[PDB]
Design a protein around this ligand. Structure first.
Ligand SMILES: Nc1ncnc2c1ncn2[C@@H]1O[C@H](COP(=O)(O)OP(=O)(O)O)[C@@H](O)[C@H]1O
Lengths: 155, 152, 50, 52, 141, 286, 94, 194, 279, 67
């Protein structure tokens, strides 16, 4: 939070108040806080819009250099913690097995959306969606491809 | 002490009784040596206690050096026969001193624990990361030495 | 939901036990940490809605 | 009684002792997940909604 | 299927006369179905099927034993049959003209754990066509 | 004497701006100042920067000037506002290092005993390197080699300053340099990882080729001591893959059974639910 | 010279390299492990010595072409596989 | 399913329903024998005090139950035949050719040849009755049935077993279930798009 | 872009959270939580976590500066210690006690509910006892039946300790009763054993002195939890007291706890039996 | 830095800490605070702003009684 405002004299309020001048720019995303509204500041004159000097030779330098991960994408990590991770993954999806089980016998013949709203369980089909399974799948294949890529490099 | 303490030398006690066994016959004072080994009954017991002590020492040093050694060579190194060598080998393993597995029909032994594929790929990945770090260090070193060497 | 999280950074909503509903869009309310806190009435609920 | 880990090769008159790796319980756990996440759902759901 | 059941039993057993009789009894329907030419082919390939099952059963089976089991009564014909089985690739039973040696299996290799996933990773191919069918079949009005 | 140094994402941009603001009139290409920070556990960190106008002449590299009174006043003010901050080293741009560095290090080491040099590439962004660290070691070049300067590079890694994550996320807010889009992002992680490996190892091959030609002095006494082990390390033996034929292939085949199939089943469940809804809607609309 | 290319240091190979007897091989490889020449496993059924070195020395800089060739072989292999996986990945990266 | 809900020794009457409590036990013993060979059944049925008491009441019933527990095949097969003869005199004779003696010895042979690699046919015959040819033909018939995971070296008369590892056997189970569920999803793929 | 955006918005701080115990899920996207200092305020419930671990009165986790529902802790016993699962451990089995019986028939009557027989509680039409109060001195041990019985029929055993409970954690006193009751409800074979009620826990003849009102409120919530139990499952609750005169009538009245057992002095004939057993 | 007692460890990185006066918060060691040595009932320093434990502290000794 970086909010800038100006203190005003008593004359600004007795004249046409809201010293915000005639333009449609400072009204963009102008949400002063409730404690700022009841104080004079951020209410006396206006709230100043903020901008960041994201100039090149400065911003390109930051993104290229500061957030540096350039040869760290070659990590293999086949089973450093992954054999027990797969044990947990199977156990978690075994819970998904019971959850996706529980769903198929609920499955009522009264527009199951009616049953679902009043009986939310956040099961595999509803909240523990395929995306989590995709995360497990992506983790496996990434370690697979990294191990296999270095295997053929091993010549 | 310098010979028999470190560097995992072959402690052939048959050779040691003349190479470093002079304390039995004649030394500077040889009074403790005659008390230990020059005695008849208790001396021969301590002679046997030197005889075996170098056998476990030879087995132990062989453990960290040789993975699989043929039965004839190990028995010759232990200055005993096959059955006596395997009996002492059983004496070490029951004390959990060494990790040894023997095929008695084949007379072949192994000292390396079977590498589980989990940690086997872990050390491979650690080997990979060590190589990756070496690439980073070499690249910085050569490029900077390149910079110094072309200041001309 | 992120805006809800940012709103809840200010505690979001404060639970109050309504007691007296005055005509001028005023309800006394009781809050467990402190107690009574006279306040106005929201736009979505009228004076009689209290 | 699974107290020992070996196989008795009577033909050679020996018993081959093997160090069984027990970390392979992911295999059996995966099968249980296969069994209790597929059998209980595919037959029941798609026999109830036979017509689609 | 009752004569078909007896045909299955004949195929497993390897006998000839019993099923030839029932084919003479109730083989007209097989002719109507158009499989009688195949029916005779099974009648004479019963030994081939029996050889595969017994080869899967045994590690080093004698060529005389397999001939006696499947009613060949000839060491040379037994050698020819196992020769004809290996060249078809149906079974791994080999020939050693000394006594008829056959190799056994081996522990799992690089591709033996991977041939299921290689032949089963079409799961996502089914997933993509199911999704594409949903793409075709989600008209709002 | 320090084991290693760690550079924060806190001073790199400040140095670059200082280069930009004082380079308006000073086109010497040489910007020299001091980097301030802390050294606690054999890990040296930089938390503040300052630039001083600085001119050079190629004649023996001994023509220069600084504002030491102003620089010392800066250090006192910085220490007064934050006691834990101390001058950890002095920095110079122009990665093509000249010979005045030994004189600068001798003068500034009264502020820091283990004087270090830092080079910031304001314009260059070669692969990802923002800056480089240098340690002064003149305690004999080697066992059987003559005297030299031999400014070595202490290993440097970009650290993780606290409370700057909020600012950098708000600043960029366009690239999202995170593991977002796990599959696609890791593909990009594999891409430039191979790009970095190919570029650096090609540089090593070029260095070996140029050593073979002999046009440049050969620092073999550390090159082969570090690269021989790299070459001979047995990562090419495939019999450990034979021992580990199921290295993870069992996990590969369960994921095929339990990620691709599960995705196919749940997608199938959605379609047949939609098909039932569409068929019922079509039949009961009128 | 051989980066695990010939990792089977048999007795005959040892005899060619050192013109030493069979019993002295045990002491020679023992001292090699102690000093740091070879740190690998030592067998006797096949007499195979695994190859790891942690004490580098002068590599005859006139013969640096050998390690340069091996390094450029690694460069070609890495780049070729990078292009191959790129060819297999045009359906995502293009 | 039978045993899991039938070891319960809570009878509605002291001797009724299944003609007796002794007949109730004989059904329990037969069902348990079909169920399992020798896991910690010592702690499941053998630990049963009422079980031990009723086997004291019936010595012949105690004889084969302990024979299977002790894995002594010389008395087991003779007693197992007596069991089959007794089941013949019982209207609960449905497994007439499947699970009288063939299934129990399949468990017994599997129990025997496991922890073994190459046990000779001649010596396993005398350790499991008599008639070396009878055991040889029995093994061949049961291997053809599918169980008794082993092969016979006829030219040397050896039983070379092939026990998969915990990984190997389980991986075989997964690929089988993979085959069944691919058949399932292909059927479900038929259900959609029609 | 939108898969990236969906993976962009799921940051939710991902940072060390805090605990303010959940009160109840009023609806979806709305909730009422109670922070440990009180300050009960309405919050918004995210869809990440819900009924799967959103039990009504269990301790949950909330963002540090946001106090928003993120995670819920399954374990409840270790929140305030107060003993833990003493089951699966033979300390004093049953007949090895030196006190023989005293009565021990009402105690075996008490263990009838843990020893199944709840199906036999119905049909037979009996109404099995629910609360057993032992108003005896340290004679007979007064816990050798709770350390036993829990092992005679495998069941969880909790010491509770009334003296420890009365402390600055009076605000979470209601919450810990909810947590220990949930632990009891989690394992139907369980028994709650509370000690040192007489001296500190809700004495009735001496006027309220400062924190005494807080103790009364804690007992009121324990009464609420035992009324909420309402024979839902086969768990049992037993208090051990030296004198039941000072105890509140709310627990003393029938309908909450009925069985009153007195464990007298060593009973010289029994005292010799106790010594022989101990010796 | 505010001072509390860690009642119990929520996860390997989540630790349930009671302020000596105020509510139980949870905090988390960032990178190197040696989470293993921290125990239920240990003394750590917290800040309502830095969100974490910056350093750990042993116990007390009854000072009035001490002197
Ligand atoms: N076999 C036994 N019979 C009776 N009492 C025993 C036996 N074994 C131990 N005790 C004693 O019973 C005591 C229980 O004391 P305590 O729990 O403090 O009493 P209360 O439950 O009344 O507070 C223990 O101190 C123990 O010494």
């Amino acid at each position: 939070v970086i909010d800038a405002f100006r203190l005003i004299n008593a004359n600004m309020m007795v004249l046409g108040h809201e010293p915000r001048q005639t333009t449609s720019n400072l009204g963009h995303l102008n949400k002063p806080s409730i404690q700022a509204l009841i104080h004079g500041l951020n209410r006396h004159y206006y709230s100043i819009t903020i901008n960041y000097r994201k100039n090149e030779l400065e911003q390109k330098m930051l993104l290229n250099l500061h957030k540096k991960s350039w040869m760290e994408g070659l990590t293999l990590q086949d089973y450093s913690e992954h054999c027990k991770h797969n044990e947990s993954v199977v156990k978690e999806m075994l819970e998904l097995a019971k959850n996706y089980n529980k769903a198929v016998e609920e499955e009522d013949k009264m527009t199951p959306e009616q049953l679902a709203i009043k009986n939310v369980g956040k099961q595999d089909p509803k909240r523990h969606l395929e995306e989590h399974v995709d995360v497990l799948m992506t983790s496996n294949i990434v370690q697979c491809l990294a191990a296999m890529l270095d295997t053929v490099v091993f010549k | 002490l310098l010979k028999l303490f470190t560097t995992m030398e072959l402690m052939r006690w048959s050779t040691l009784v003349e190479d470093y066994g002079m304390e039995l016959r004649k030394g500077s004072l040889e009074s403790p040596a005659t008390d230990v080994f020059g005695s008849t009954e208790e001396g021969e017991k301590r002679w046997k206690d030197l005889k075996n002590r170098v056998v476990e020492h030879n087995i132990r040093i062989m453990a960290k050096y040789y993975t699989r050694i043929t039965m004839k060579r190990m028995a010759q190194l232990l200055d005993l026969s096959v059955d006596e060598s395997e009996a002492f080998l059983s004496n070490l393993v029951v004390n959990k001193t060494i990790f040894a597995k023997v095929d008695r029909l084949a007379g072949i032994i192994n000292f390396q624990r079977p590498k589980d594929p989990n940690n086997l790929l872990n050390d491979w990945s650690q080997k990979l990361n060590s190589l990756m770090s070496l690439v980073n260090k070499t690249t910085h070193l050569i490029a900077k030495e390149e910079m110094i060497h072309n200041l001309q | 939901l992120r805006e809800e999280l940012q709103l809840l950074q200010e505690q979001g909503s404060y639970v109050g036990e309504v007691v007296r509903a005055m005509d001028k869009k005023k309800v006394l309310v009781k809050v467990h940490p402190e107690g009574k806190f006279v306040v106005d009435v929201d736009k979505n609920i009228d004076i009689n809605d209290v | 009684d699974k107290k020992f880990h070996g196989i008795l090769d009577q033909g050679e008159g020996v018993l081959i002792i093997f160090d069984e790796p027990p970390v392979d319980k992911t295999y059996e756990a995966a099968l249980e997940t296969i069994q209790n996440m597929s059998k209980v759902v595919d037959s029941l759901y798609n026999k109830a909604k036979k017509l689609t | 299927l009752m004569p078909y059941f007896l045909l299955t039993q004949a195929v497993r057993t390897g006998n000839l006369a019993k099923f030839n009789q029932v084919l003479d009894q109730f083989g007209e329907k097989f002719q109507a179905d158009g499989t009688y030419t195949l029916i005779i082919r099974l009648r004479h390939n019963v030994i081939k099927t029996g050889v595969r099952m017994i080869s899967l059963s045994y590690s080093r089976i004698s060529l005389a034993d397999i001939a006696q089991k499947l009613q060949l009564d000839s060491p040379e014909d037994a050698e020819f049959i196992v020769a004809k089985a290996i060249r078809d690739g149906v079974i791994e039973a080999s020939i050693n003209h000394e006594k008829g040696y056959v190799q056994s299996k081996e522990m799992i290799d690089i591709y033996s754990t991977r041939e299921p996933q290689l032949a089963f990773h079409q799961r996502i191919s089914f997933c993509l066509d199911i999704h594409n069918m949903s793409v075709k079949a989600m008209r709002f009005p | 004497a320090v084991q290693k140094v760690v550079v924060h994402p806190l001073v790199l941009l400040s140095v670059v701006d200082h280069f930009n603001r004082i380079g308006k009139v000073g086109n010497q290409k040489r910007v020299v100042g001091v980097l301030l920070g802390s050294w606690q556990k054999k890990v040296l960190d930089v938390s503040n920067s300052f630039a001083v106008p600085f001119d050079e002449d190629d004649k023996d590299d001994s023509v220069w000037f600084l504002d030491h009174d102003y620089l010392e006043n800066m250090y006192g003010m910085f220490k007064k506002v934050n006691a834990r901050e101390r001058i950890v080293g002095w920095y110079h741009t122009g990665p093509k290092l000249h010979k005045n560095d030994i004189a600068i290090n001798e003068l500034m080491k009264r502020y820091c005993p283990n004087s270090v040099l830092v080079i910031i590439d304001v314009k260059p962004k070669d692969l990802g390197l923002p800056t480089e660290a240098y340690i002064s070691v003149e305690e004999v070049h080697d066992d059987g080699t003559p005297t030299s300067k031999t400014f070595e590079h202490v290993t440097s890694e970009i650290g993780a300053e606290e409370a700057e994550e909020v600012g950098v996320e708000h600043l960029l807010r366009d690239i999202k340099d995170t593991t977002v889009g796990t599959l696609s992002q890791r593909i990009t992680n594999q891409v430039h990882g191979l790009k970095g490996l190919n570029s650096k190892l090609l540089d090593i091959r070029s260095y070996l080729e140029k050593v073979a030609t002999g046009k440049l002095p050969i620092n073999h006494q550390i090159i082969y001591q570090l690269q021989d082990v790299f070459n001979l390390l047995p990562d090419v033996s495939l019999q450990e893959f034979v021992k580990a034929f199921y290295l993870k292939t069992n996990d590969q085949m369960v994921v095929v059974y339990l990620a691709s199939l599960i995705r196919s089943v749940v997608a199938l469940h959605n379609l047949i639910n939609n098909k039932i809804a569409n068929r019922d809607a079509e039949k009961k609309e009128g | 010279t051989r980066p695990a290319n010939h990792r089977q240091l048999t007795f005959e190979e040892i005899a060619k390299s050192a013109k030493i007897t069979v019993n002295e091989v045990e002491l020679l490889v023992m001292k090699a492990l102690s000093v740091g020449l070879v740190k690998g496993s030592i067998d006797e059924v096949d007499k195979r010595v695994h190859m790891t070195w942690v004490q580098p020395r002068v590599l005859d800089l006139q013969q640096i072409k050998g390690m340069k060739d091996r390094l450029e072989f690694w460069c070609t292999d890495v780049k070729s596989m990078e292009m191959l996986v790129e060819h297999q990945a045009h359906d995502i990266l293009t | 399913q039978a045993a899991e809900l039938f070891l319960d020794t809570v009878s509605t009457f002291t001797s009724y329903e299944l003609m007796d409590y002794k007949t109730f036990v004989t059904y329990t013993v037969y069902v348990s024998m079909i169920a399992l060979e020798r896991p910690d059944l010592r702690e499941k049925v053998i630990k049963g005090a009422e079980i031990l008491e009723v086997l004291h009441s019936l010595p012949a019933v105690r004889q084969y139950l302990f024979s299977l527990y002790e894995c002594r095949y010389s008395v087991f097969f003779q007693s197992l035949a007596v069991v089959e003869q007794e089941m013949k005199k019982d209207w609960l004779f449905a497994p007439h050719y499947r699970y009288y003696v063939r299934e129990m010895r399949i468990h017994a042979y599997s129990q025997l040849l496991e922890s073994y690699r190459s046990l000779t046919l001649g010596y396993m015959a005398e350790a499991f009755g008599v008639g070396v040819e009878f055991i040889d033909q029995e093994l061949s018939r049961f291997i053809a049935a599918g169980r008794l995971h082993c092969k016979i070296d006829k030219v040397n008369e050896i039983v070379e077993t092939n026990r998969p590892d915990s990984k190997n056997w389980q991986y075989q189970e997964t690929i089988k279930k993979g085959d069944l569920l691919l058949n399932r999803v292909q059927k479900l793929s038929r259900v959609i798009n029609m | 872009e939108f898969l990236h955006a969906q993976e962009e918005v799921k940051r939710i701080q991902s940072i060390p959270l805090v605990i303010g115990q959940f009160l109840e899920a009023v609806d979806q996207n709305t909730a009422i939580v109670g922070s440990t200092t009180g300050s009960n305020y309405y919050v918004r419930i995210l869809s990440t976590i819900d009924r799967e671990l959103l039990k009504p009165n269990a301790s949950v986790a909330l963002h540090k500066h946001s106090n928003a529902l993120v995670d819920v802790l399954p374990p409840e016993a270790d929140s305030s210690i107060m003993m833990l699962t003493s089951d699966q451990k033979p300390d004093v089995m049953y007949a090895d006690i030196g006190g023989m019986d005293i009565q021990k028939q009402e105690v075996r009557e008490a263990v009838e509910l843990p020893l199944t027989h709840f199906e036999l509680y119905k049909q037979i039409g009996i109404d099995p006892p629910r609360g057993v109060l032992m108003y005896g001195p340290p004679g007979c041990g007064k816990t050798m039946l709770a350390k036993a019985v829990a092992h005679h029929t495998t069941a969880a055993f909790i010491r509770v300790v009334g003296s420890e409970f009365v402390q600055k954690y009076l605000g979470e006193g209601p919450r810990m009763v909810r947590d220990v009751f949930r632990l009891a409800k989690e394992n139907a074979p369980a028994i709650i054993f509370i000690d040192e009620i007489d001296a500190i826990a809700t004495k009735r003849f001496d006027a309220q002195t400062g924190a005494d009102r807080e103790v009364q409120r804690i007992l009121l919530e324990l009464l609420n939890q035992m009324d909420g139990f309402d024979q839902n499952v086969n768990v049992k609750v037993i208090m051990a007291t030296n004198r039941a005169d000072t105890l509140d009538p709310a627990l003393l009245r029938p309908g909450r706890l009925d069985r009153k057992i007195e464990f007298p002095l060593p009973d010289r004939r029994q005292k010799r039996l106790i010594f022989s057993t101990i010796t | 830095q505010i001072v509390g007692e860690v009642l119990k460890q929520l996860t390997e990185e989540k630790f349930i800490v009671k302020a000596t006066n105020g509510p139980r918060y949870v905090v988390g060691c960032r990178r190197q605070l040696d989470k293993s040595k921290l125990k239920p009932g240990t003394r750590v320093a917290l800040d309502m702003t830095t969100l974490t434990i910056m350093r750990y502290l042993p116990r007390e000794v009854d000072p009035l009684v001490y002197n």
